[PDB]
Design a protein around this ligand. Structure first.
Ligand SMILES: [N-]=[N+]=Nc1ccc(NCCCCCCN2C[C@H](O)[C@@H](O)[C@H](O)[C@H]2CO)c([N+](=O)[O-])c1
Length: 765
C-alpha cells in the first residue's frame, strides 16, 4: 500500500509549470522530455524586439510585478504578470486533467490585455517554444492547409517512452491579426500564425532565446538577399515574422502577432487518457481548481485575529501561492571539487589562505546527472534549491499538502552522497548554471548548511502521532505509509547526523577546555575573514581572526535539533540501540551549550575562540546567534538562562524594533557595518523561529508564560504587519526588512521564507 500511494503521488505530481526560472513554461518531472516556454514582446521598430522580448524571470523598472494568485501543483493555478515595458497585463492559467498512464493531461490559457498607457494598436509578438530531449522520441507539426501559415490551430503530434503518444495544440486564439499590404506578403503571406520545426543537439534545446533569434536573423538575411530594403521596407512585425516551415524536429517554434488584446490556449492531450482536452475543458477545470483552492486555504490557513480581514486573506493567498508556485524540477550535472584537499580540513591558523590555494587548483569537475524537485527562494535572482531555505519553505507547504513536502524532502535526500553530504546550493544543468558566475558554481563537500529540513520532519512526526484531497494527506492518514517513509529516510538522516559530527567537529581536547562532555563541540567549515556562508548568516560577526579553535553555538544547536528528531524517529522505528546513543548526545549538548557557550557576564550565548594565549575566550555579539539554543527549542521552559534571553529579545535598545527582531544589536560594534547583510536587518525566517518558541512557552505553565505571551503577541503583530505593509505598497515580498524604516530591502520576489508569514498569521502552533 506504501508502493500504491507512491505511484499515485508520482502520477499526481508528474506535470506542472515546473520552470519557475521563466515567466511561463511546463516540463514533467523527467530529466530528458518535453518542455514548453512562453515569450512575448511589443515591436515598434526594426530593432526593439530583441530588447523587449520576455522569457527568463527578472525584476527591474520595466516590470511592475508578477506572481501566482493561486497555485497547487496537483491542480494548477493562475499567474498574473504586470509588464510596464510592453504595456501588457498578462494572465497565464494552467490546469491539470488526470487520466491515462502517463501522468495525465494539462492546458494553459495565455491572456494579454493592453494597459491604459499602451498604444491601442500595439503589435505584440508571442511565441510558444516547444522542445523534446531524448534519443527515441518524435514530435511533428501537422502541416497547414493554407500556404504561408495557419488560419486555425497548430497541432503537434509526438511520442516518447516517458509520455507515450500525445498531442499538443496551440489554438487559433482571439484578437486582431495585423495584415501587411507589402510586396513581401506574396512570398510570406499577409500575416498569420507560423511554425518552424527544427533539430539541434539535445543539450542546447534549453537555449530558447538564441535559438529563436538565430531564426529571426536568417529571416532578415533572406530579406536583404532578396532585395527587400530601406527604399520600401515591410513593417517591423512582418520583418520579424518567421517563414512558415513545419515538420519533424526536437524544436518547434510557434509564433503569432497580435494587434491589441489577445488570448490563446495550449492543450496537451495524453493519448492514453482517451478523450482529448478541449478549451471548454480548460475553462471548467480552471473554475473548479479555484473553488478547491479557496476551500483548502480557508481550512489550512485560517488567519487569526487581528488578521482575519479580507485584506490579510488576499495577502496570505499571495504570499502562499508565490511560495508553492516557485516549485521547480531541475535536472543535470553539477560542479563539485572532489579533491578533498587537506587544506579543506582547516586545522591550522590562517586556514582561509590555504583553502584559497586549494581552490586555485581548480580540481572541480561536473558530476551527475542529478534531479531535484524543490521550491526556491527567488524566481528572478536565484531560482534553485538552497538546503536550509527549503526547511523554511516546506513549513507552510507541509500544512497545505504533507505528501508534497515529503516528496520534496525525499528529493533532497536522494542527492546525499556516500559520506552524508548534500551540497547546500543545487545548480543542476547548463540551464541552471547560466544564472550563476562560474566562480560561484563549485560546491565543496566540507560545506554544511543548517539542517532545517528536520523541522519539517518534526512537524510530520507530531502529525503522525495524533481525490487529490485524499492524496495530499495519505502519508499521515495511513500510519503504515508514514512509518515506511521514515523507515526508508531514517538511515540517511543518521548518515547526515554522523557527517556533521565527522566534518564539522570542534576542538575541545587540544586546549585548556573544561566541559561536561569531551565530544560535543562544533565549528562551521568554510569561514573566511569576514564571512561564514555555510551557517546561513553570511556576515554575522564571528571571532576575529577565524581560528581552528572556534566553536559556534548556532551549529551546536542545530546538532541538538537533529538529535531530538532522531530520538523521535528512532523511537518510532524501535531503533533502541540508536535512541540510547542519541539520548546521551542530547544530554551532553545540553551541558556543553552552557559549559562552552554561556556568558554569565553578558546574559546570553556566544561563539567561542582561542586566545592569543591559547585560552578559551567567549566572543559575544548580541543578535540572532546569541539566541540560538532558544530558537532551536533546546531550553527548558523554566531555564533562568531562557529568561535572560527573553529580556534580550524584548529589549528595544538591543534586538527589539517596531518591525521585528534585529539580526544584530544596535549596541554591537558591528551594527550596520560593511554589507550589513545580517548585521541589523530583520529576517523573517529567524523571527519565525522566535515567534514559534515564544508561543510554546506562552501555552505552558512556567515563570515566563506571561512574558512570552506578551512578546509572542507583539512580535507576531510586528512581523506580519511589516511584511503586509510592504506587500501592500510594493506588491513584493522582500528578503529582509529595515529595522529603522520598516522598508523591505535587498531582493524582491523573495518567496522565499518571507512567505512564512502565512503560517505566523495562521497561529495555533
Ligand atoms: N540587481 N540584481 N540583484 C541580484 C542580487 C543577487 C544575485 N545573486 C545571489 C546569489 C546567492 C544568493 C544567496 C541568498 N541567500 C543568502 C542568505 O544569507 C542565505 O542564508 C540564503 O540561504 C541564501 C538563499 O536564500 C543576483 N543574481 O542574478 O545572481 C542578482
Amino acid at each position: 500500500l506504501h508502493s500504491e500511494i507512491g505511484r499515485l503521488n508520482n502520477q499526481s505530481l508528474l506535470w506542472g509549470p515546473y520552470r519557475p526560472n521563466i515567466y511561463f513554461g511546463t516540463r514533467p518531472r523527467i530529466g530528458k522530455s518535453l518542455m514548453t516556454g512562453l515569450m512575448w514582446g511589443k515591436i515598434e521598430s526594426y530593432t526593439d524586439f530583441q530588447h523587449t522580448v520576455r522569457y527568463t524571470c527578472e525584476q527591474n523598472e520595466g516590470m511592475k510585478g508578477y506572481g501566482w494568485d493561486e497555485y497547487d501543483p496537483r491542480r494548477g493555478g493562475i499567474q498574473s504578470i504586470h509588464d510596464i515595458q510592453n504595456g501588457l497585463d498578462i494572465t497565464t492559467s494552467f490546469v491539470k486533467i488526470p487520466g491515462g498512464a502517463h501522468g495525465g493531461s494539462w492546458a494553459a490559457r495565455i491572456k494579454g490585455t493592453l494597459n491604459d498607457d499602451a498604444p491601442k494598436d500595439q503589435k505584440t509578438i508571442v511565441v510558444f517554444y516547444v522542445s523534446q530531449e531524448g534519443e527515441n522520441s518524435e514530435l511533428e507539426a501537422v502541416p497547414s492547409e493554407n500556404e504561408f501559415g495557419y488560419e486555425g490551430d497548430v497541432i503537434l503530434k509526438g511520442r516518447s517512452e516517458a509520455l507515450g503518444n500525445y498531442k499538443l495544440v496551440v489554438t487559433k486564439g482571439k484578437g486582431v491579426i495585423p495584415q501587411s499590404d507589402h510586396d513581401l506578403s506574396r512570398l510570406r503571406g499577409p500575416g498569420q500564425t507560423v511554425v518552424q520545426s527544427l533539430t539541434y543537439p539535445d543539450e542546447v534545446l534549453w537555449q530558447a532565446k538564441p535559438i529563436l533569434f538565430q531564426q529571426l536573423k536568417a529571416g532578415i538575411d533572406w530579406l536583404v538577399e532578396n532585395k527587400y530594403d530601406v527604399a520600401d521596407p515591410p513593417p517591423p512585425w512582418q520583418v520579424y515574422l518567421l517563414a512558415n516551415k513545419p515538420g519533424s524536429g526536437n524544436v518547434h517554434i510557434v509564433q503569432k502577432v497580435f494587434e491589441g488584446d489577445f488570448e490563446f490556449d495550449i492543450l496537451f492531450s495524453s493519448e492514453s487518457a482517451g478523450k482529448e482536452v478541449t478549451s471548454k475543458d480548460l475553462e471548467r477545470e480552471v473554475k473548479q481548481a479555484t473553488e478547491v483552492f479557496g476551500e483548502r486555504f480557508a481550512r489550512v490557513f485560517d488567519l487569526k485575529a487581528p488578521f482575519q480581514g479580507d485584506n490579510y486573506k488576499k495577502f496570505g493567498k499571495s504570499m502562499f501561492s508565490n511560495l508553492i508556485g516557485g516549485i521547480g524540477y531541475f535536472y543535470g550535472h553539477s560542479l563539485v571539487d572532489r579533491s578533498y584537499a587537506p587544506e579543506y580540513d582547516e586545522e591550522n591558523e590562517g586556514f582561509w589562505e590555504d583553502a584559497a590555494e586549494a581552490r586555485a587548483r581548480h580540481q572541480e569537475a561536473l558530476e551527475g546527472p542529478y534531479e531535484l524537485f524543490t521550491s526556491i527562494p527567488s524566481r528572478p535572482f536565484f531560482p534553485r534549491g538552497f538546503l536550509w531555505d527549503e526547511g523554511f519553505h516546506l513549513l507552510p507547504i507541509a500544512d497545505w499538502d504533507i505528501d508534497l513536502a515529503l516528496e520534496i524532502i525525499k528529493s533532497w535526500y536522494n542527492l546525499m552522497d556516500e559520506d552524508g553530504w548534500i551540497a547546500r546550493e543545487q545548480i543542476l544543468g547548463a540551464e541552471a548554471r547560466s544564472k550563476v558566475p562560474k566562480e560561484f558554481q563549485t560546491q565543496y563537500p566540507h560545506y554544511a548548511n543548517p539542517p532545517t529540513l528536520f523541522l519539517v520532519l518534526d512537524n510530520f512526526v507530531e502529525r503522525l502521532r495524533k481525490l487529490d484531497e485524499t492524496l495530499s494527506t495519505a502519508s499521515v492518514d495511513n500510519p503504515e505509509v508514514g512509518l515506511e517513509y521514515l523507515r526508508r529516510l531514517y538511515p540517511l538522516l543518521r548518515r547526515q547526523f554522523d557527517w556533521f559530527r565527522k566534518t564539522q567537529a570542534g576542538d575541545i581536547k587540544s586546549y585548556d577546555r573544561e566541559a561536561y562532555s569531551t565530544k560535543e563541540a562544533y565549528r562551521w567549515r568554510g569561514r573566511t575573514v569576514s564571512h561564514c556562508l555555510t551557517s546561513g548568516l553570511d556576515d554575522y560577526p564571528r571571532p576575529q581572526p577565524p581560528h581552528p579553535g572556534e566553536l559556534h553555538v548556532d551549529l551546536m544547536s542545530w546538532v541538538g535539533v537533529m538529535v531530538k528528531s532522531l530520538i523521535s524517529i528512532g523511537s518510532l522505528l524501535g531503533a533502541t540501540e540508536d535512541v540510547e546513543f542519541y539520548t546521551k548526545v542530547l544530554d551532553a549538548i545540553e551541558h556543553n551549550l552552557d559549559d562552552l557557550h554561556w556568558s554569565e557576564k553578558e546574559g546570553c550565548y556566544c561563539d567561542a575562540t582561542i586566545d592569543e594565549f591559547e585560552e578559551h575566550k567567549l566572543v559575544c555579539h548580541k543578535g540572532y546567534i546569541s539566541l540560538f539554543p532558544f530558537l532551536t527549542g533546546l531550553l527548558k521552559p523554566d531555564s533562568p538562562k531562557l529568561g535572560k534571553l527573553l529580556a534580550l529579545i524584548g529589549d528595544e535598545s538591543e534586538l527589539w524594533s517596531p518591525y521585528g527582531l534585529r539580526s544584530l544589536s544596535k549596541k554591537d560594534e558591528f551594527y550596520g557595518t560593511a554589507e550589513n547583510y545580517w548585521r541589523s536587518p530583520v529576517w523573517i525566517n529567524i523571527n519565525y523561529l522566535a515567534i514559534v518558541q515564544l508561543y510554546n512557552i506562552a501555552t505552558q505553565d512556567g515563570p515566563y508564560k506571561e512574558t512570552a505571551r506578551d512578546l509572542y503577541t507583539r512580535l507576531r503583530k510586528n512581523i506580519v504587519e511589516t511584511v503586509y505593509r510592504n506587500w501592500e505598497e510594493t506588491g513584493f515580498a522582500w528578503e529582509q526588512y529595515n529595522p529603522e524604516t520598516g522598508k523591505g530591502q535587498r531582493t524582491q520576489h523573495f518567496t522565499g521564507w518571507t512567505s512564512l508569514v502565512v503560517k505566523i498569521m495562521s497561529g495555533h502552533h
